[PDB]
Design goal:
It is built from four helices and eight strands, in the order αααβαβββββββ. By secondary structure, it is an alpha+beta fold. The strands form two sheets. Strands 1-4-8-7-2 form a five-stranded mixed beta sheet. The longest helix has 23 residues. It is classed as transferase. Keywords: C3 exoenzyme, glycosyltransferase. The assembly is monomeric.
Amino acid sequence: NTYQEFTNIDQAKAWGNAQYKKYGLSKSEKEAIVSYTKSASEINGKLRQNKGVINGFPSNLIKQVELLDKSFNKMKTPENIMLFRGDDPAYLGTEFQNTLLNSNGTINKTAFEKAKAKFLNKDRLEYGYISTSLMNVSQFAGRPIITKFKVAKGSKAGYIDPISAFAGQLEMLLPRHSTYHIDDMRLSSDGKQIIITATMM
């Protein structure tokens, strides 16, 4: 199957804005999504720390998590689509935090091989929500790891950009507790990034 890759910002914004108009998110769901864009590091951190169990969270955060989860009943992609994410070295593991990059900002080729052994052709489970973009935006251009997610028609996926507190990210949110499979891992032309291709489940 083939996955729509947006190659133009205006095309992407237009498609996304059209999807957002159809969602019919409630007042509470919108409020929860706005807050997510302000506090995503905290929310996703707590979900990872607790392996998806929200029972011990403060009551306002439980409600927020439930409203985000519920939002995806209304937010599905109408087609196969490619989504993009940038990540820092710790995404690969604690062992990559101060080893993935040499002093030139170029990927250490030995660390790259270890990352390939750890992850290539394997599934990964993410306890947090996954913030992505419809394109490889300049925002995460400093980042050493770029992942391209292949997300199938009908999958839970929401263009939340219109109500995000921040600009320029063409942001598509994926639900928490998602699994994806790493199909391909390779160094970029200039050796400064690892490009990962993954299929969302």
